Amino acid sequence: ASMQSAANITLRQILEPNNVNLRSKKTHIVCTLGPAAKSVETLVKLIDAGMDICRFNFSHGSHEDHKEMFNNVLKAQELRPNCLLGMLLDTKGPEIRTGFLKNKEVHLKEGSKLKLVTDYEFLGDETCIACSYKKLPQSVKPGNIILIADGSVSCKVLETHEDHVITEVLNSAVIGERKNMNLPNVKVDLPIISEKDKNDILNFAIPMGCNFIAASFIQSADDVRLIRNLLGPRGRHIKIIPKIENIEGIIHFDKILAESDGIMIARGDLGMEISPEKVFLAQKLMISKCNLQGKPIITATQMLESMTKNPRPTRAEVTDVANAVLDGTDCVMLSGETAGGKFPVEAVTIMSKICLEAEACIDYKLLYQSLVNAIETPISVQEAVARSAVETAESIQASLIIALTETGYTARLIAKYKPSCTILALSASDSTVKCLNVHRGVTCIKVGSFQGTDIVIRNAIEIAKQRNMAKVGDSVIAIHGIKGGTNLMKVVQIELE
Amino acid sequence: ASMQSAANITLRQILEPNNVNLRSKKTHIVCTLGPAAKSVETLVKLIDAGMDICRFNFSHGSHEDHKEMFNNVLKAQELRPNCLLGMLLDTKGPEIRTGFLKNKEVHLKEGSKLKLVTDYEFLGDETCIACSYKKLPQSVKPGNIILIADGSVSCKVLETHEDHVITEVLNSAVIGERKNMNLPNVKVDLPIISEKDKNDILNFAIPMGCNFIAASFIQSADDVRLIRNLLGPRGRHIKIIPKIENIEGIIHFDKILAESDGIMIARGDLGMEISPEKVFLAQKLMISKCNLQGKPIITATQMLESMTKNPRPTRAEVTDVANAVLDGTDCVMLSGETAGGKFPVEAVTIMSKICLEAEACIDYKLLYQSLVNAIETPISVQEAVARSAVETAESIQASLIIALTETGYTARLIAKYKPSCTILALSASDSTVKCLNVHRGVTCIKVGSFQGTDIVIRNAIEIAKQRNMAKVGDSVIAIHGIKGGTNLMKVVQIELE
Amino acid sequence: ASMQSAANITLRQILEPNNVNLRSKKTHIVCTLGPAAKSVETLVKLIDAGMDICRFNFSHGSHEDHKEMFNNVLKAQELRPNCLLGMLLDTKGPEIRTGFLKNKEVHLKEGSKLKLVTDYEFLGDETCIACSYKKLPQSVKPGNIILIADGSVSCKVLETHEDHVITEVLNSAVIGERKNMNLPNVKVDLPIISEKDKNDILNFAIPMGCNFIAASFIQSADDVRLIRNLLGPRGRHIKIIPKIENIEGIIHFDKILAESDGIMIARGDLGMEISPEKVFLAQKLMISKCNLQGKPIITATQMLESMTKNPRPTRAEVTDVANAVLDGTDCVMLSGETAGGKFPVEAVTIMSKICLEAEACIDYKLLYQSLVNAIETPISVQEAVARSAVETAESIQASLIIALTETGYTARLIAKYKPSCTILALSASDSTVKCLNVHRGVTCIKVGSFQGTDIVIRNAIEIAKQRNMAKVGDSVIAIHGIKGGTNLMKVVQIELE
Amino acid sequence: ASMQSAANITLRQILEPNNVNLRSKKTHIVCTLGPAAKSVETLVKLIDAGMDICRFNFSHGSHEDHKEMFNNVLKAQELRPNCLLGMLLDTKGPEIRTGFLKNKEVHLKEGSKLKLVTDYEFLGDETCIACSYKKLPQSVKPGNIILIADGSVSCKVLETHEDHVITEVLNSAVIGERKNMNLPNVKVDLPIISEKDKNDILNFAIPMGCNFIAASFIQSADDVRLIRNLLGPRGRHIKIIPKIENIEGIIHFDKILAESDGIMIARGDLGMEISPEKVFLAQKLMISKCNLQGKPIITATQMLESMTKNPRPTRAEVTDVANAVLDGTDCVMLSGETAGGKFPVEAVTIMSKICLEAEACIDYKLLYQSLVNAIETPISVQEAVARSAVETAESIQASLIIALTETGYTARLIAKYKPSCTILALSASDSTVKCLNVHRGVTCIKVGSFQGTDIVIRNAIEIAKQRNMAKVGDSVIAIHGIKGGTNLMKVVQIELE
Ligand SMILES: [Mg+2]
Ligand SMILES: [Mg+2]
Ligand SMILES: [Mg+2]
Ligand SMILES: [Mg+2]
């Protein structure tokens, strides 16, 4: 619950321009893949500008271009082999919509009474509109506030009956049809995953190499394990990333985080379920709790979201990305319409530059001590050795922490302590090398199995030099055997003769 | 240059709603007064929602409604006497504009050559456009970048001649006429204050009770003292607030701040003179340097800036205001078009709620020690006593620090250490009670002169109880004699019998 | 239980000699008054060398020279009026002695059996010796160790019977008669105060102006309140200083300290009741617990204790005094035979110089923060204001903290936070001005009653200048009204015109 | 110059007795070998009680029993092979003595004039005494103080002539003949090493396996390198330990420490060259400077020094040893006559118990951070890895830090950071395994050369279990390759199957 991040901003960093390669940044970028952001040329353009994880939802599109979207990613990877992309699938989850209307548009007047019925075939008007949530009367109570069309109107519940509720319109607006609805401070009793979603996961998501499931509208730890149950050993290697989008998720965040492999701060329902002035508290709290537990967090950030002119970001967009990095997020995220419809590459480019600037101003010594003093006394041998690699790297100004890991556990322990240098994770597991992209500062390279540790080390050293991640005269940290008995930390200096 | 702010966010603060009165917040709100935000009813509505300082520029309007704007403020004050409003005048300062065009619109093509001439009567086209800055050739050099129409196009200087320069258009766009221009990393050689501005200040601003002069485009300490020179003893009591809007101001910020009474982070030129990814560094650095020197800072924050739908703020708008408060700003500011054209009261209302939430999450003990460890060893008797009032107030959880001051110096020393409670400043100087609103947490009340200190204290105590600033059983800190020999700090408990 | 003290030792302090007046030291000296250390000339000599409290026990001497000792002190005071001496009476308390012997000397052999009988008239030998403690069989158990003649022999209890116990001699030595005895880890069931002691207190100690009662062999909080009970309102103003001399006192130290006005670390029984290697832990722990509670502590320190040559102290004697000051003792003490028989003035002189050196090396800023972080969150208005005086004095380098107090409570709160400067306590109570000498750094001056606070302040200022405690250009802290409502802290600068 | 040591004393440690083996202590004991402390039975008795380094001076004795003293040590080692003893030779160095007297005793009277002549054959009286220092007139000046017979008399220099000086006796005492002399604040111009000492070193000290040379009366860095020069490659592996015994050594301590392998605080001349009240400052400063540089320090501590009764230590003796350990000394030392003449084994036994108690109360986490924050930013790879072993050992509560080193450099880097557990140093160099005993907490075991690192590790593990230094279920730290490229830190858990 207690938070801190130490920045050290100099006049020199403000004036001297940055020419560091965008992909060397520690913060990773989740980019939602839209219609235009799919030309194999453009995904490569998006890779060069700093995308690390591809995000998609099967809410729209075909089954034809859903997998036409896959192979275009899978071939975009082959045109840039030094970049291993994560694949995240966003579930639809529970969702509440209004019904259809006689005029297909009504002008609800402030102070008027509005009936909400559960018969979804009822064609409504300004006096009575259908709601897709059949259990709406059994969930809300008199005094509860119902939001319609992204909170365009708020309705206070006056009466609850078996098949309908009666509300008072609190503000006058004009509504379309099939608009979204929100029930602040009310638990939605809908199945966490659909039967469409379940087979989209079990038979199409997992065979195509999907690594993350962003579970929409997670409200309890049960929802997480219910999902993990039905994925089975067929999907035992996929990371479940609950999306906290309402009060229920925030109330139970600790136990949801316990069952989770990460957290995603989605741009969407949370803006309507919580007052806007309290959202920034939730974002900062969730990032802190994820940082302390070593769990990765993805934070939605606005960037060229609305442009009625040319693509130059607003000041609030810049500080939103910068402060999310300073708050301690592993990934910043470009959402669907935030690619601007037309400028996805320019948006991720600016985001990468902001991440580099925010990363360069961090006092990593102070950040490390802050983490150490916030984590409990009984840490394991594995965590202590991972701790020692980070502190040794900072003291000697090492260029890399090379972590040998097969399940990714070693690299996650190191990333928990936020080193200033890149964590070069070496794995023989294809599932591991595309699951660790969600952690800040971790760059993975697949290696063969049944190889001596020392051979894998200097082979990583050679390709680190090839990728300009380390030069001659540098020191790098090598850490392996974390599983033991074999927990080990080495310093080796880059030479060649 | 080193920065830190300690937040303590709890789940309870996220869930429990805030019903604290908006005007009890510590962060103050500078609200730019526009056309519609002038109904005496609406300024009172703006006062209730949390305005503390009124901002205006004489760029537009008449001389008739400029003072029709004054008395409407001066009578809005009389309808809410517990709120003493500051009055800030924004100067126009140096300003660079393009010329007029034959078509009054040109489509400059990327890669084409564009001549910029100093003959402002020249009616231009896509090959040659006039620039109002007559000394443009003598200021920019080959390689300098010239921005037109809020950075809609960027032109690299290829040739400089006596009366014109030749540039290469770097991106294709369509321009209007009389559009603004920016010269990044180039000092603009224009008079800091006009002769229109000078007489707007000396003969209309100072007789109407203007307290702050926001000097646009301050580039050096000379600009500040040149302004202070020409205001004379007629305006010796007005605070000069330089606006840092380009690289030159940032380069010389320390010496500009030395000659200043405060700083204003304006929404405008700084977005074009500095790369967007580096603006957040400048904002945070300037706030830190102002905090360490005890100088107030006003930060522009976006809130309901663009609405093509109903007035609900974006997430980036919320975090922008919240993080500006957490960064340590004395005032957040609503700019002209950010009142939304139509929703100024709702914007300041949300801002006040955000300030209250951000203020309530601050760890004031940690913040106090952070300030103390960053300020130099040789502090004066006056600062030490002001320091003692803040620490005593936190330890005993006092409700108020009552500061008796005539020049405002005592209250500024206390505000420098950011107490968790309100600073109730008592002054006999009308100039002082409307100059201290720019400091965070300071609320002023005018008192009569030639009054015993003890009588002024309990009289402030009584009206503090009347304004719900303190109740029976509370402790308050009384601090006076700061000028001596007379530097004094008292604790008194609120009783009545 | 946690301890810390920050020293800052420079090469300059090691080389440059100290010429500061000995009586300006902050650590005070308790000096036991012996036979030769009683010439009115020598007590004045002892005053000049740094005595602050006179210690005596009525174990020996007459009733004639017991009060002949008083008036010689009371007239030694009149020859040096700037020094108000405290008067401490040491009670005898429980005490255990062996019996008389046929040869009046026995050679107990290691491994032999030794009977200890309760019949004190029995004239003993190497097989059976009487013990004055009649309840010895009911207190010790088989396995308990009995010490004789300052631990010259140790006897393990083998048998306990009604009127005797049987022990095995563990080491061979030769014993006199009427030698002391100790029962480690066994509670002694003897009355805490005698009927001789009780009337020595109620009818001779309190009428002669005795301020402190050093209660020998305190084992429980009951012993303290049993003493305080029988002193009554006739002695309600005398400070009870328990002497912790065995395991029982250490076990119950917290509750003994709660009922106490201070603690005395006596040189004596504690060396035999606890293993020597564990005594330094007890001394440091008790000093820390007294420091945290604001209770004064007196620590016995060796200095010219054994001299078979001329009076130059050993290195262990020097570090013992120096580390006791660094551990945080309010007073260091010269015991009876430690005056060397012949050199009391030289011993207190060296002690004063050691205290000055140890005091000058303390980092008072670090010490203050260490105290503040160890004391609980809910401190009172009085303690917070006393806290503010100490911190203000350090920040502005004030020469004095002038505390106006009648019960001494104000000065004790200030002394709890160990300021680097002298605490000048002003009281109208004769009992208060001679009770506060036990606190470190507090120098008292008696003032008249019914005087305005401001008049008392500058009158103390004038005599502070007369005593070279403050000069022109100095700042001093004035603190009064601590009782309210009236809690107040002032800074005044020393001028005269 | 800044000092700190964090103690955590509990009531439980005061009451619960210690049964830990004495040789498992971290502080090591230098014991001066005297006449009686030489029975092969008694040196073994001294080993069991905690001796780690044997100290001797060739000032007395024969050449026959000087080496009869060696082989008795060398065979005492063979009766306890788990204890490798260091051998320290104390040089005589510069030394100043009075002459012979007609009565062989004079009563110098305070105020009388005393001539000191350089003709050492002159048989003197109370008017004129010879001094062995021939250059005495050229070293002291009028106003200098000359000390005779352990400071029994002090003489202020009144006149300096070619072959004599005239002094005024400042105190009356009776002197023997050939008594020592001291010249406070005056550099003694005598050869640092004699020709007797030089051949005692080059032809008898180094062939017998002497490891440390305690150079008496070191006054400059030149003295250290002049000694190291004349030892040559024949003694390149011997550690030179300057003895700082006068003002000159303290003035130049930093540069003396730079050329040194350690420091010894000798009991002797320093008590006369510096005022007693300033000696504790010098001891604490020198220990701090040695701690920060990683250089070992030996501190003389009093223990059963004077006993006119049975051997129970005084309180000042106990705190002297305990505070020396808390100050941060690597070794405490029993000097010649401090073995009591009769009780050397009992004195070292009590010292070991005191060291164990003082060591057990140290807060090692706080001590480690204190060291880290006092050492400069640019530390090497070797020091960083040694740092990581200590912090990892504390976090996981490892039982041992096993250091593989041949020159001892690895173990010294680890000992610099004062781990709570034993440092088990493994070396193939006989010179290294008997030089590292001077560092706190380092226990050496000789191993064969040309052995794989992993084989040496678990072999040390097995004999660690045999010596009760580690049990099953423990974690130990293994650190090797510190020379590279090969700097390495491992954690291994103790199992056996
Ligand atoms: Mg959703
Ligand atoms: Mg401007
Ligand atoms: Mg006693
Ligand atoms: Mg010597």
**DSSP state string for B226-272:** HHHHHHTGGGTTSEEEEB--SHHHHHTHHHHHHH-S-EEE-SSTHHH
The tokens describing C47, both together, are 């005053």
Ligand in nearest proximity to the CA of D90? 4
Place of tokens 């036979």: C35
3-state class of D413 per DSSP?
A: helix
CA distance C284 to C290: 10
Tell me whether residue B268 is annotated as binding.
yes
User: Which residues are within 8 A (CB) of A379 and not within 5 positions of it... i.e. 6 or more apart?
Assistant: A387, D395, D396
CA distance A334 to A351: 9
Containing A216, the helix (H) or strand (E) segment is none
User: Which residues are within 8 A (CB) of C272 and not within 5 positions of it... i.e. 6 or more apart?
Assistant: C147, C150, C151, C182, C184
Helices D276-293 and D315-327, packing angle to 10 deg: 30
**Any CB–CB contact under 8 A between D495 and chain C?**
no
Of B380, B381, B490, the CB nearest to C488: B490
Q: Give the strands of the sheet with A113-117, arranged side by side.
A: A128-130, A113-117, A164-169, A153-160, A145-148, A181-182
Distance from the Cα of residue A402 to its chain's centroid? 25
b/e per residue B22-56 (b: at least 16 CB within 10 A): bbebbbbbbbbbbeebbeeebbbbbbbbbbbbbbb
User: Which residues are within 8 A (CB) of B170 and not within 5 positions of it... i.e. 6 or more apart?
Assistant: B110, B145, B153, B154, B155, B156
**Any CB–CB contact under 8 A between C396 and chain B?**
yes
CA distance A180 to A149: 5
**Any CB–CB contact under 8 A between C380 and chain B?**
yes
Please provide residue C24's backbone torsions phi and psi, each rounded to the nearest 5 degrees. -85, 0
DSSP secondary structure code for residue A203 in this structure: I
Question: C365-494 in CATH: which number?
Answer: 3.40.1380.20
Distance from the Cα of residue D133 to its chain's centroid? 28
Task: Answer whether the bond into residue B124 is a cis peptide, omega within 30°.
Answer: no
Using CA atoms, how far residue A326 sits from A332, A355, C408, in Å, is 11, 9, 52
* Binary contact (D250, C313; C-beta < 8 A): no
The tokens describing B215, both together, are 């000097």
Please answer whether residues B355 and B325 qualify as being in contact, where contact means their C-beta atoms are separated by less than 8 angstroms. Answer: yes
Q: Which amino acid is at A288?
A: S
DSSP output for D472-490: TT-EEEEEE-------EEE
E strands of C60-185, at which residues?
Answer: 86-90, 106-108, 113-117, 128-130, 145-148, 153-160, 164-169, 173-175, 181-182
Q: Catalytic: A97?
A: yes
User: Which residues are within 8 A (CB) of D497 and not within 5 positions of it... i.e. 6 or more apart?
Assistant: none
Please answer whether residues A154 and A168 qualify as being in contact, where contact means their C-beta atoms are separated by less than 8 angstroms. Answer: no
Containing C491, the helix (H) or strand (E) segment is strand C488-493
* Binary contact (C276, D350; C-beta < 8 A): yes
CA distance D67 to D87: 12
Nearest C-alpha neighbor of B96 from the set B201, B221, B189: B189
Please answer whether residues D29 and D53 qualify as being in contact, where contact means their C-beta atoms are separated by less than 8 angstroms. Answer: yes
CA distance B42 to B33: 11
Bridge partners of D154, per DSSP, are: D147
Q: Give the strands of the sheet with A263-265, arranged side by side.
A: A239-242, A212-215, A86-90, A51-57, A28-32, A331-334, A297-300, A263-265
Q: How many residues in total does chain B contain?
A: 497
Chains C vs B: touching, with 3+ CB pairs under 8 Å?
Answer: yes
Closest residue in chain D to residue C367, using alpha carbons only: D4
Nearest C-alpha neighbor of A6 from the set B373, C184, D11: B373
User: Which residues are within 8 A (CB) of D264 and not within 5 positions of it... i.e. 6 or more apart?
Assistant: D214, D241, D242, D243, D244, D297, D298, D300, D333
Place of tokens 């255990």: C96
Using CA atoms, how far residue D219 sits from A77, A117, C483, D284, D288, in Å, is 72, 99, 59, 19, 19
Containing B333, the helix (H) or strand (E) segment is strand B331-334
Please answer whether residues C118 and D279 qualify as being in contact, where contact means their C-beta atoms are separated by less than 8 angstroms. Answer: no
Place of tokens 């010239």: B146
E strands of D262-386, at which residues?
Answer: 263-265, 297-300, 331-334
Please answer whether residues D69 and D88 qualify as being in contact, where contact means their C-beta atoms are separated by less than 8 angstroms. Answer: no
CA distance A127 to D198: 113
CA distance B301 to B327: 12
In chain B, the N- to C-terminal Cα span, in Å, equals: 52
Q: For the beta carbon of residue B144, count every other beta carbon within 10 angstroms.
A: 17
**Any CB–CB contact under 8 A between B87 and chain C?**
no
In chain A, the N- to C-terminal Cα span, in Å, equals: 52
CA distance D92 to D245: 12
User: Which residues are within 8 A (CB) of B189 and not within 5 positions of it... i.e. 6 or more apart?
Assistant: B135, B138, B139
Please answer whether residues D435 and D86 qualify as being in contact, where contact means their C-beta atoms are separated by less than 8 angstroms. Answer: yes
Ligand in nearest proximity to the CA of B272? 2
Q: For the beta carbon of residue D179, count every other beta carbon within 10 angstroms.
A: 18
Closest residue in chain B to residue C458, using alpha carbons only: B485
Q: Which of B397, B477, B487 to mutate to test the interface with C (most CBs of C within 10 A)?
A: B487
CA distance B58 to B199: 12
Contacting subunits of A (3+ beta carbon pairs below 8 A): B, D
CA distance C301 to D316: 7
Place of tokens 């908006």: B22
Place of tokens 């910068």: A322
Ligand in nearest proximity to the CA of B190? 2
**Any CB–CB contact under 8 A between A392 and chain D?**
yes
**Any CB–CB contact under 8 A between A492 and chain D?**
yes
b/e per residue A159-173 (b: at least 16 CB within 10 A): ebeeebbbbebeeeb
Of C267, C281, C318, the CB nearest to D357: C281
DSSP secondary structure code for residue A320 in this structure: H
User: Which residues are within 8 A (CB) of C452 and not within 5 positions of it... i.e. 6 or more apart?
Assistant: none
CA distance A55 to D260: 64
Tell me whether residue B237 is annotated as binding.
no
Q: Which amino acid is at C195?
A: E
CA atoms within 13 A on the CB side of D88: 32
What dihedral angle (degrees, nearest 10) is formed by the CA atoms of A478, A484, A486, A490?
A: 30
Place of tokens 């302040």: C457
Q: Catalytic: D284?
A: no
CA distance D69 to D76: 11
Q: How many residues in total does chain A contain?
A: 497
Ligand in nearest proximity to the CA of D273? 4
Of A7, A150, A284, the CB nearest to B284: A7
Distance from the Cα of residue D239 to its chain's centroid? 12
Q: Which amino acid is at C389?
A: A
CA distance D89 to D70: 11
Bridge partners of D7, per DSSP, are: C3, D362
CA distance D455 to C284: 47
Nearest C-alpha neighbor of A93 from the set A206, A208, A242: A242
In chain D, the N- to C-terminal Cα span, in Å, equals: 52
3-state class of D7 per DSSP?
A: strand
CA distance B463 to B442: 16
3-state class of A309 per DSSP?
A: coil
Query: Obtained via which technique?
Result: X-ray
Please answer whether residues A240 and A232 qualify as being in contact, where contact means their C-beta atoms are separated by less than 8 angstroms. Answer: no
CA distance B247 to B270: 8
Please answer whether residues B461 and B494 qualify as being in contact, where contact means their C-beta atoms are separated by less than 8 angstroms. Answer: yes
Nearest C-alpha neighbor of A439 from the set A467, A403, A411, A469: A411
Nearest C-alpha neighbor of C275 from the set C151, C441, C186, C181: C151
Q: How many residues in total does chain C contain?
A: 497
The tokens describing A307, both together, are 């442009």
The tokens describing C6, both together, are 């920050």
Nearest C-alpha neighbor of C87 from the set C105, C109, C72: C72
Helices A344-360 and A315-327, packing angle to 10 deg: 50
b/e per residue B426-441 (b: at least 16 CB within 10 A): bbbbebbbbbbbbbbb
* Residues of B annotated catalytic, as ranges: 55, 97, 243, 301
Using CA atoms, how far residue D3 sits from A300, C9, C370, D288, D378, in Å, is 49, 8, 15, 6, 21
3-state class of D86 per DSSP?
A: strand
Q: Which of D487, D494, D495, D496 to mutate to test the interface with A (most CBs of A within 10 A)?
A: D487
**Any CB–CB contact under 8 A between B493 and chain C?**
yes
Q: For the beta carbon of residue D256, count every other beta carbon within 10 angstroms.
A: 23
User: Which residues are within 8 A (CB) of C81 and not within 5 positions of it... i.e. 6 or more apart?
Assistant: none
**Any CB–CB contact under 8 A between A11 and chain B?**
yes
Bridge partners of A28, per DSSP, are: A331
CA distance B226 to B204: 19
User: Which residues are within 8 A (CB) of D324 and not within 5 positions of it... i.e. 6 or more apart?
Assistant: C319, D283, D287, D299, D301, D332
Please answer whether residues C184 and C219 qualify as being in contact, where contact means their C-beta atoms are separated by less than 8 angstroms. Answer: no
Task: Answer whether the bond into residue C336 is a cis peptide, omega within 30°.
Answer: no
What dihedral angle (degrees, nearest 10) is formed by the CA atoms of B305, B308, B313, B319?
A: -60
DSSP output for A253-297: HHHHHHH-S-EEE-SSTHHHHS-HHHHHHHHHHHHHHHHHHT--E
Please provide residue C61's backbone torsions phi and psi, each rounded to the nearest 5 degrees. 75, -175
3-state class of B325 per DSSP?
A: helix
Exactly one of A23, A115, A243, A434 is catalytic; name it.
Answer: A243
* Binary contact (D316, C302; C-beta < 8 A): yes
Nearest C-alpha neighbor of D332 from the set D318, D321, D347: D321
Of C150, C173, C250, the CB nearest to D14: C250
Helices (H), A330-434: 344-360, 364-374, 381-396, 409-415, 430-433
Q: Specify binding-site residues of C for Mg(2+).
A: 245, 269
Nearest C-alpha neighbor of A51 from the set A27, A18, A19, A17: A27
Exactly one of D301, D392, D410, D422 is catalytic; name it.
Answer: D301
The tokens describing B434, both together, are 């409307």
What does DSSP say about strands A145-148 and A181-182: parallel, antiparallel, or unpaired? Answer: antiparallel
- Residue A106, classified by CB atoms within 10 Å of its CB into exposed (0-12), middle (13-18) or buried (19+), is buried
Q: C243: CA distance to ligand 3 center in Å? A: 8
Using CA atoms, how far residue D42 sits from B21, D56, D209, D264, D484, in Å, is 84, 16, 21, 25, 46
The tokens describing D166, both together, are 């005239």
Please answer whether residues A64 and A186 qualify as being in contact, where contact means their C-beta atoms are separated by less than 8 angstroms. Answer: no
* Binary contact (D320, C320; C-beta < 8 A): yes
DSSP secondary structure code for residue C338 in this structure: G
What's the gap in Å between the CA of A282 and the closest CA on chain B? 7
Q: How many residues in total does chain D contain?
A: 497
CA distance D173 to D35: 31
Q: Give the strands of the sheet with C128-130, arranged side by side.
A: C128-130, C113-117, C164-169, C153-160, C145-148, C181-182
Please answer whether residues B152 and B164 qualify as being in contact, where contact means their C-beta atoms are separated by less than 8 angstroms. Answer: no
CA distance D156 to D152: 14
Place of tokens 């032999």: C112
Q: For the beta carbon of residue D373, count every other beta carbon within 10 angstroms.
A: 8
Of C381, C387, C391, the CB nearest to B475: C381
Exactly one of A301, A329, A338, A349 is catalytic; name it.
Answer: A301
CA distance A50 to A29: 7
Nearest C-alpha neighbor of B88 from the set B28, B13, B4: B28
Phi-psi category of residue D209: left, alpha or beta, with phi > 0 → left and psi -120 to 50 → alpha? left
E strands of D97-211, at which residues?
Answer: 106-108, 113-117, 128-130, 145-148, 153-160, 164-169, 173-175, 181-182
Nearest C-alpha neighbor of B269 from the set B240, B227, B300: B300
Helices (H) and strands (E) in chain C, counts: 17, 23
